Symmetry: D3
Subunit: 334 residues, 6 copies
């Protein structure tokens, strides 16, 4: 029917450039013969045509069938997708565009001892006649969230930006809007509440189910992208560690390391001998440790007769088969 595999990418903003940067880091650089046209290509994967588009246009064109793949925030996906079974998240966490969609209410007067959705719902002020008015851009997700949390008496007004104005303006009581830093809303005398968070968004690789099950090339490129993306993301959270351990043999050392359950797993330790002039004073284990627990791991393996540790970076980590690929095939099935 159509020859090329079409990837939609954000066109404007920091979301656009962060996406292009992530792609360059995975050897999926975008190239553009005509810089102020909206068509481009990733040469790494021939037959992959990219189309710069606004996040919701990407969701719209995935549904309408004019795109096969896309990168968008989970906010825009769940709002305009509306739970359509054709939209499949391939990677749910590209580690940018971090924000959450949450409820904000005034600190001020009638809301002062209210720090929970339970306690907000508990108030006597709201029956069907005078309901809890709440301004949002998420005209789909707001209703669904309130129904799903058993609150019947709410009325949503829509605004296309600057929602913080609504409570000061008197046009609503609460709001439902994106937050990432938390700056704006204390400065407009608003506050979040426990269980106010509707979802935590970030950039995601998304695909049409019909596109992937339909054409082998679409399934194959999605697989390549997934692997290249997670290989990059995994590596960004890992170091390779080279520690010098005391011991008579290589295999003796290997055990002591392999005994410690806290000590970081990978595929497994390698151990080669560290020479000196007299022969074989230390043994060099080569493991692969998460950045979060680097110092802990250094401390642990000092207790097990370790000495000099050499931390070096990783570019990529390709696991033989990703849990996400399994999960994706499972999401495709029905």
């Amino acid at each position: 029917s159509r020859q090329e595999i079409r990837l939609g990418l954000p066109s404007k903003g920091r979301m656009s450039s962060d996406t292009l940067d992530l792609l360059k880091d995975c050897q999926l650089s975008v190239k553009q013969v005509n810089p102020r046209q909206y068509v481009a290509q990733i040469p790494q994967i021939s037959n992959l045509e990219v189309w710069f588009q606004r996040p919701k246009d990407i969701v719209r064109k995935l549904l309408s069938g004019d795109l096969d793949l896309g990168i968008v925030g989970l906010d825009v996906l769940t709002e305009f997708g509306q739970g359509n079974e054709d939209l499949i998240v391939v990677h749910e966490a590209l580690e940018y565009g971090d924000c959450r969609l949450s409820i904000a209410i005034p600190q001020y007067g009638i809301f002062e001892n209210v720090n929970s959705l339970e306690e907000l719902a508990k108030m006597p002020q709201w029956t069907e006649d005078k309901p809890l008015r709440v301004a949002t851009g998420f005209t789909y997700l707001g209703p669904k969230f309130m129904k799903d949390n058993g609150i019947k008496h709410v009325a949503f007004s829509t605004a296309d930006g600057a929602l913080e104005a609504a409570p000061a303006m008197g046009i609503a009581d609460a709001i439902l809007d994106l937050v990432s830093s938390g700056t704006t809303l204390k400065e407009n005398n608003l506050k979040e509440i426990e269980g106010g968070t509707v979802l935590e968004s970030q950039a995601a690789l998304v695909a049409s189910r019909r596109s992937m099950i339909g054409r082998k090339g679409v399934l194959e490129t999605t697989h390549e992208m997934l692997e290249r993306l997670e290989a990059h993301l995994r590596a960004m959270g890992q170091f390779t560690v080279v520690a010098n351990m005391r011991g008579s043999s290589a295999e003796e050392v290997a055990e002591r390391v392999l005994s410690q359950p806290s000590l970081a797993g990978l595929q497994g330790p390698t151990v080669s001998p560290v020479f000196c002039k007299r022969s074989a004073d230390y043994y060099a284990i080569v493991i692969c440790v998460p950045k979060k627990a680097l110092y802990k791991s250094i401390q642990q393996l000092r207790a097990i007769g370790g000495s000099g540790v050499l931390v070096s970076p990783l570019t990529y980590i390709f696991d033989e088969e990703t849990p996400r690929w399994r999960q994706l095939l499972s999401k495709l099935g029905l």
Copy 2:
């Protein structure tokens, strides 16, 4: 309920900042006690509350009666206002936001020798079964424009941006979108056509009719706002001129320039005499000429014996009663 008169200003972009620049030039500067909020005041006019909003919501809030006045582009006004007669344009030409909503088609294929709206409506390819597809943001105004120029075989897809893409992407045959500088649509191999323009927009002051009639202070402040805005805008296209004519009296000279009908009128000339000694060589006429016709007016005055001319700037020009104020009272039924 509400006590205050409310002016909605654009919150974002060049539109926002140009608006604030204009208001400062007319002694209507906005002052913000809390810069991170959306509330503000214009000190010059007491009881006048400024809410920064998106242009779309300025229109909506004017209709929902949550704003009284607003500054907004005619594109956004006619699109989301939908001709609603509660919305009255007080000033239609604040001289920024200059752009036009017009149709653009490709220039390559079947359109190579199609340079008119009727020329493309004439084409056979478009039928009730497979019609002319046009991508637009202006979901309301497009259909309306096609009807009013007799084009029945048309279908409208929506998009949120990057409409230039759609012909190349093959999701549409033409687009209906804003154009100012005009570069963007050569860069995507598109062209405007004869009579393809739907409207020419710029920033405009508008007012709720229900607010003007039934809320105190609204018609008052609208009058002040209108006179101040116009006084500035008028003065921007004028110079005061002081030219030295040759003659034997003030009234002799006065009659010469007053009998030049091409000469630029103000309310009228003013003569004082220019002194010397060998007493009263030239006579100094002071008129007020449009900037557009300066050098012409200087040549004209040289034909009437004029020598030295001094051009100087004007800050404001207040006519006794503006035609725009008259036209408002006329639109109110008066």
Copy 3:
């Protein structure tokens, strides 16, 4: 030793560039042959040599006899000058550098029902044993303000910056610092107090008494600078207005505007005839006045009430008065 008149200008910040802007608007532009040296010149005044320094050092050098004139905030002058009689404020208000030195305390703690400086003095917790701890850069001015307000029980810690966080940090109970934008100290949960303002500051022209009497040309150039500065500052608050009025003579019209006391008190109106054309002459009369910017629209409405038609508003660049009070006041401060 020295043979040139020296003007100290601020070296750093908005304060520096605001100063340089103001001097350019008054035809006193600073030229600089070596953009990152500290010496410079104002050419419009022969033998005037600029030296860029920190505000603090401008006060020091005025006192030390190394500068003759300086532009400096009143906060800095009073703190580092300490009411020294050699330092005279020539112009107390150049309408930039606006801020105030005021006391701030936490909203949260025991200070919820405390919004007056004597309410703060009233509180029982403080005594010579364990006094009111207060952080400030203004280590001279703080003590003086509270001695002068009869508050004996205070201890002054001294910081050089980031004072808004001393209460959070438990190093002091209140602070004494500058406020201008207003935002910073509500964001650190502090508040201002009634009577807690020590002084209003802004950029000011100061001069050395020793210099004015003792160095040739200083007083002459102080005079010129004062006059140009004030003319510009007065001019920035005025428009020239040309209203067209209805009358059968020049003087008839001149009365109706002069018998309106609400109408602006310039030096006085100028009436001249507006000619017009089958063959007629001289309908309106054009009065020219000099109205404050604040009350423009008011004064337009006033003139329309007495038969006014078209108003043309135009800018003023300088307004030189015959003799400013400030010049007389300076000579009186000098005993001249």
Copy 4:
């Protein structure tokens, strides 16, 4: 066989952007439908076609006769024009692109007591065999300059950028190049000398002689262009000044002003009466003259000497003379 009138404008740098700002200020705004082409239009003048070019290409294209008019620095005009009689400076002073082409020599070495052209010319070192080596961009003007002053023993290595290096590098003894700020060559241990500057440049309006005589509308638009530029430029050097004079009559006060010769020379003063009220009398009269900006303060002194009270200074956008002296000079250069 070209049919439009063609103005060459600098395509690059601050030269380019100052040129466009000047033409905007004179209602000769440049409009460009395709910003990434080099062709453009000035709408105010019908038939006028701008071409953005590098200054030396502007000169080369005026000579080859692909342009009619151009704006370039007198530096590049003189270098590449070479005294060609087809080029005529219509305006030699647009008040931007200010720089001088001059000789710079080392401070440090055998030059410490050499502060003059003749002083360095007289020195015994330089001879037919080993000459005075001079690094320069200006390959035409260097030889011409030093022949015209009489320095036989000189050799001209050419370089096209970064000339201050040449002395320090050893490739030459002196440079000939552009200076403005005077900063750069203190930092490379060099100095200018007396009688060492070849030329003082700024932006200039230049016209082809063949174009003015030969092509329809060139001489006509050169006139318009000159008169609008000159009007703007004159107005930037002037103010209008209105002063209040105590007097009996308006001819009496005029006599007092006109017989002060050092006071400014606008075509002439205007006196109108100032009405005041007592009773509606008309005590003083309002003189309005137009005064050079540099001379504003003296002119106010000079007016207060003649019982002048309060002065209002205000700006001028343009001043058109009846016939600008430059137009008389241009016609003179054309053999009229």
Copy 5:
């Protein structure tokens, strides 16, 4: 005389900044005590003086013997060098400064059906009476290119900038100039043609033959520069890969890998056992190859075919080969 070894580096623009970044990436960082001067130095190599010059002055000074080494574009080398045998290209591809000198012609005109240089040479419009006019900065290389392709009906004009104008301006038929991104000449209705590329350029390391042969240190420092540069540039195209193979022995694994000819060319694999968690030991074996970045994914797939499992990719900073063929080729050019 002169003691020091001199490297010319571009002074201006992006060429300058990219050259300085590359040298920093090779531990050949330039240090500059006086940023306003043109002299500087690289510490890592002793007695090496850096001089910032415009790229054509670099080529000019290499010829005159005032520089020993230089980094410039092959365009400016060939245009100003003119095949001079004193100039030798040591490294012809530093992977920045990429552009191509090519002929461009109109799209519209009569030129729509010519997309080849011989197809425009086939056009019979051009004779000795009225030849093919072509404007260019490259006055030496233009004729020499046209001569060598057999087109004697051409006359060259010279412009120094804004050459895309010359067709629309009417002053020439085609142009010869630099292209990289490709956008600028679409915007002026021009197109390239097949075979019309005169030269593909990039930044190159160049040396004077007289300097290498007859100056102490040059050949030595050239050797070091060449190797440090090429080591960095090679490592930018490579990764190191640590893949886990299923095997019964280390040498069994090594065989399976080396039996793949399509698999990467490291000097060889380094296999080591990977230990496993009751008392189990040593199931996987870890090879380390060194694959090009181009072929990474392919090579992972190739490895997974041979029972490869987890792969770890990590960066290289430098790859020093034993002998660089570029170094051997240099010595060859010195008759050595």
Copy 6:
């Protein structure tokens, strides 16, 4: 009293941003919930509370016991700490904030043949009557420096900026100030001299002795901080190198490498066989060592003389020694 551990970090300038960069690279990133406060956290360490402060106030609060740890320059530590023995420098060398406090002297006048501190002392001009006047912000250190080097008659004037002016405006004979780039004082015609440097400075980790001994948590987090920081700083001066050697056996090549004393010491080499091809196996062996960056090329020459060929240089992000010399030094400073 107070429950958190408190680290002072610079609040303004490059000093502040370079500090936060270093802390980011050592997994000690600062997280600020409220950017417009001066309080912050490092999440990596439990109960650690960052306070942004001016460097002077970090020293002042370390003495007053309101902070436990700080990062400041050694310039600020010795001026404001004044050898106080509660203040202990934990790491003296964070490789940013590089400058030196040193005397500068005019080059022009009586000081032309004065390039030494003793030559300056020796000068007859200075006496108890009229001393050597020297301008400085370092009110404590200047006098102490002069008394330590027996300069008998010296008056010290204070300034808080723009000291380079002080000679030019005749208020001082010399200055004592920070110098980093060294450019600022050629511009203002000053020079440093032999023995001018009072101290060389850079950013340093500093701890309160009472806080280490008395407040538990501190010593533990100091250990952690020191180890992470030095681990980073050491890794910035190393590469890992993987040369491969021709050899018959594995400890044969280990020998030849360990016999070279000039070759890179780490803890020692590792070596594994490199396999390569009817059927051939195990030609050369891959040595892996850890060379300092400054000595990289030297080490590669060295390894080639031992029959080495290919070298693969790669980056290290941290090097953790088992126990650091600076930690031992810290303990011994706690009488331990």
